[PDB]
Amino acid sequence: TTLLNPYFGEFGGMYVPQILMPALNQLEEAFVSAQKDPEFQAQFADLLKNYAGRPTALTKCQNITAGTRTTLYLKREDLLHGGAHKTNQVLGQALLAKRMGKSEIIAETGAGQHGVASALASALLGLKCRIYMGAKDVERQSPNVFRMRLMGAEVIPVHSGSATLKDACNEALRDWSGSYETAHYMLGTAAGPHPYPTIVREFQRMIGEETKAQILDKEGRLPDAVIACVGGGSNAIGMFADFINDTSVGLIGVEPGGHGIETGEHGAPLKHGRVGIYFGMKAPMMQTADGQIEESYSISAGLDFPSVGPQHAYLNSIGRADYVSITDDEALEAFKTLCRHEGIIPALESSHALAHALKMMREQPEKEQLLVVNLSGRGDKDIFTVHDILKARG
Amino acid sequence: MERYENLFAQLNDRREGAFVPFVTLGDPGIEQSLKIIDTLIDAGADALELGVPFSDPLADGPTIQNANLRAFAAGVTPAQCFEMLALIREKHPTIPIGLLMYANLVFNNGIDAFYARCEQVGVDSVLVADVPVEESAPFRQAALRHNIAPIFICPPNADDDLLRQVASYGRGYTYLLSPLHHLIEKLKEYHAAPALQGFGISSPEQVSAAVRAGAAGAISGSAIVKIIEKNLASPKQMLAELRSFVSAMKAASR
Ligand SMILES: *Cc1c(COP(=O)(O)O)cnc(C)c1O
Ligand SMILES: [Cl-]
Numbered sequence: 001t002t003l004l005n006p007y008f009g010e011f012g013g014m015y016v017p018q019i020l021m022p023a024l025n026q027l028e029e030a031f032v033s034a035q036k037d038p039e040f041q042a043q044f045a046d047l048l049k050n051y052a053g054r055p056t057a058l059t060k061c062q063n064i065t066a067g068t069r070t071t072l073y074l075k076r077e078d079l080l081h082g083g084a085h086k087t088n089q090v091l092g093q094a095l096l097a098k099r100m101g102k103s104e105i106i107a108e109t110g111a112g113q114h115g116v117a118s119a120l121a122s123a124l125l126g127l128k129c130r131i132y133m134g135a136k137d138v139e140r141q142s143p144n145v146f147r148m149r150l151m152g153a154e155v156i157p158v159h160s161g162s163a164t165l166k167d168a169c170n171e172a173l174r175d176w177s178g179s180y181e182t183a184h185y186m187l188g189t190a191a192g193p194h195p196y197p198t199i200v201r202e203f204q205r206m207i208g209e210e211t212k213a214q215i216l217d218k219e220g221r222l223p224d225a226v227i228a229c230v231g232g233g234s235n236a237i238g239m240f241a242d243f244i245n246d247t248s249v250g251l252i253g254v255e256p257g258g259h260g261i262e263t264g265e266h267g268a269p270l271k272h273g274r275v276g277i278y279f280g281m282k283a284p285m286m287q288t289a290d291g292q293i294e295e296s297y298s299i300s301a302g303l304d305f306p307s308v309g310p311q312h313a314y315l316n317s318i319g320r321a322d323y324v325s326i327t328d329d330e331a332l333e334a335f336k337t338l339c340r341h342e343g344i345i346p347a348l349e350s351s352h353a354l355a356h357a358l359k360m361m362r363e364q365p366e367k368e369q370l371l372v373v374n375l376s377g378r379g380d381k382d383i384f385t386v387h388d389i390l391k392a393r394g
Numbered sequence: 395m396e397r398y399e400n401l402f403a404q405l406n407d408r409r410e411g412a413f414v415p416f417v418t419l420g421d422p423g424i425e426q427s428l429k430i431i432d433t434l435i436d437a438g439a440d441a442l443e444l445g446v447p448f449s450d451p452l453a454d455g456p457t458i459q460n461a462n463l464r465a466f467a468a469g470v471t472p473a474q475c476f477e478m479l480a481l482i483r484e485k486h487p488t489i490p491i492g493l494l495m496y497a498n499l500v501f502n503n504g505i506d507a508f509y510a511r512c513e514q515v516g517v518d519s520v521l522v523a524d525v526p527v528e529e530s531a532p533f534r535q536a537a538l539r540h541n542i543a544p545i546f547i548c549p550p551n552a553d554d555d556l557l558r559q560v561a562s563y564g565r566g567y568t569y570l571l572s573p574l575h576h577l578i579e580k581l582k583e584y585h586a587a588p589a590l591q592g593f594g595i596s597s598p599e600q601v602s603a604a605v606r607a608g609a610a611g612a613i614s615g616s617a618i619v620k621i622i623e624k625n626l627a628s629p630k631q632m633l634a635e636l637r638s639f640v641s642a643m644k645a646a647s648r
């Protein structure tokens with residue numbers, strides 16, 4: 001028994017060991033309580049505005065849409081403290097942790113940016129924070145490891161299994177099962193067991209709520225479509241949420257295509273996976289024919305999640321949102337195009353969203369359309385990977 | 395044929411407790427694991443709890459985490475796990491065979507189809523480690539439709555509503571992790587399936603204490619796999635120490 005529906009249509013649930021169910025029922029009730037508490041909302045808004053920098057800007061692209069009838073706006077979550085949208089929900093989760101009397105934070109991460117997000121939130125709110133990460137992710141993201149440890153976080157490498165994010169997701173839950181009375185599990189995306197998909201959406205929905213008010217102020221109308229990249233689905237559902245009942249607004253989520261879908265080396269389980277049960281949820285997943293869960297490949301480190309949030313799978317099955325894929329080369333071209341034409345270095349994650357927007361604009365250049373792309377992060381972390389690839393090609 | 399009801403009836407007629415060892419199928423190899431299971435049963439194992447190698451066992455500790463890696467390294471797949479299970483049933487018709495599963499391997503080829511193949515190979519029970527009793531409806535229905543016992547874990551943090559659900563929907567036996575004496579009473583009160591205490595059961599003193607506490611037996615998980623993990627280079631000395639340990643733990647239940 002729960003207060004909220006753990007399922008979005010046929011997707012979702014709480015597929016955790018029985019020992020973790022009290023930790024989830026506790027987290028749900030604290031969340032429902034915090035949602036009705038004006039003091040919790042006032043403190044959440046206070047950290048978002050005076051510490052993270054909300055509201056973020058909505059930049060109209062001057063030069064990128066020349067020659068076409070497309071008006072492109074960029075929701076600048078890249079201007080948030082930390083450099084990505086992940087700061088919004090970790091501030092809410094850490095405030096929830098204080099509401100439950102928790103003094104420790106457990107977090108998993110792959111690319112290291114959620115770990116950096118969790119470390120900065122725990123440091124601000126006075127929480128001891130230990131972070132699990134794949135040992136192979138520890139070696140490729142040593143800059144982000146130093147960031148977390150500079151901010152007082154304990155980085156524990158996970159050599160289990162594949163030594164990647166899905167093993168960090170495992171090792172964190174193992175810790176939380178015996179420490180949930182003092183520690184809180186700060187999940188990274190809009191996936192995992194209930195109430196995490198619901199919680200991360202509500203702590204990220206200011207993205208779309210601001211975008212709506214800003215586009216009404218600037219263009220006097222709602223957008224034709226909002227486009228966002230999808231790793232687990234936090235920045236996409238944060239943009240989509242306030243537009244779902246606006247049925248004239250298109251909801252496009254972009255999944256990593258890697259080297260191409262037909263090559264198998266991608267990360268698009270929502271459209272090219274198979275529905276399974278893992279990480280406490282029923283959702284589309286990257287998995288073998290026998291049911292072993294694979295890893296998502298992408299040039300984007302932040303899109304390495306082998307599954308997808310259940311509300312996205314639900315939104316897709318009913319046709320409310322559409323989900324496409326963008327290859328590594330398409331996102332790279334979008335990366336270079338935004339730099340030369342707007343002076344904004346985007347994250348390789350958000351470049352997938354922009355890449356599809358450029359596709360919509362380029363394939364039908366005389367189509368009059370108002371598009372908003374959620375720029376979920378800056379790309380200064382990616383200039384080294386972009387350099388080595390453009391140094392290798394030629 | 396409910397081998398659990400007939401094993402618990404027997405063990406009650408001799409005022410004994412059950413000793414149920416756990417191993418991962420195909421660890422460290424297919425042929426080696428088959429001889430390992432044969433060693434456990436001759437040593438005095440009353441039932442068997444067997445694990446199918448899963449790529450992401452988020453509910454198991456590092457010692458079993460390595461057992462899955464040792465099995466994946468040998469190439470064991472769910473397909474040859476069930477041909478193993480079939481061979482084990484044809485060798486030991488009376489012993490109860492339990493499976494520790496994860497929800498994806500059950501859901502993968504259809505839930506009802508997974509339990510259909512367990513019934514084909516003679517599996518008596520299945521515990522799905524990552525399906526709580528609140529999400530158990532479709533799994534236990536498919537398990538009962540194929541004469542499989544749905545096994546449920548009753549954790550130490552169990553409130554009264556959980557004990558009532560585990561008693562109602564649980565069959566075969568109840569997986570106790572754990573004063574457990576108060577939890578054993580409430581399960582007997584609500585007519586739950588006989589409770590097997592499975593948590594760090596390492597020494598013969600813990601098998602004895604579990605029975606005295608009121609449980610119907612003890613489940614040893616990491617203890618057996620640790621012995622396999624220790625003697626990976628010595629095949630027989632592994633079985634040798636396996637036979638000594640299991641017959642010591644089985645005597646602790648008499
Ligand atoms: C984390 C990451 C993503 C993927 O996160 P979602 O859960 O899909 O929202 C997207 N953009 C950036 C900058 C990221 O770091
Ligand atoms: Cl601002």
Ligand SMILES: [Cl-]
Nearest residue numbers: 055210213214
């Ligand atoms: Cl605003």
Ligand SMILES: [Cs+]
Nearest residue numbers: 231267305307
């Ligand atoms: Cs993904």
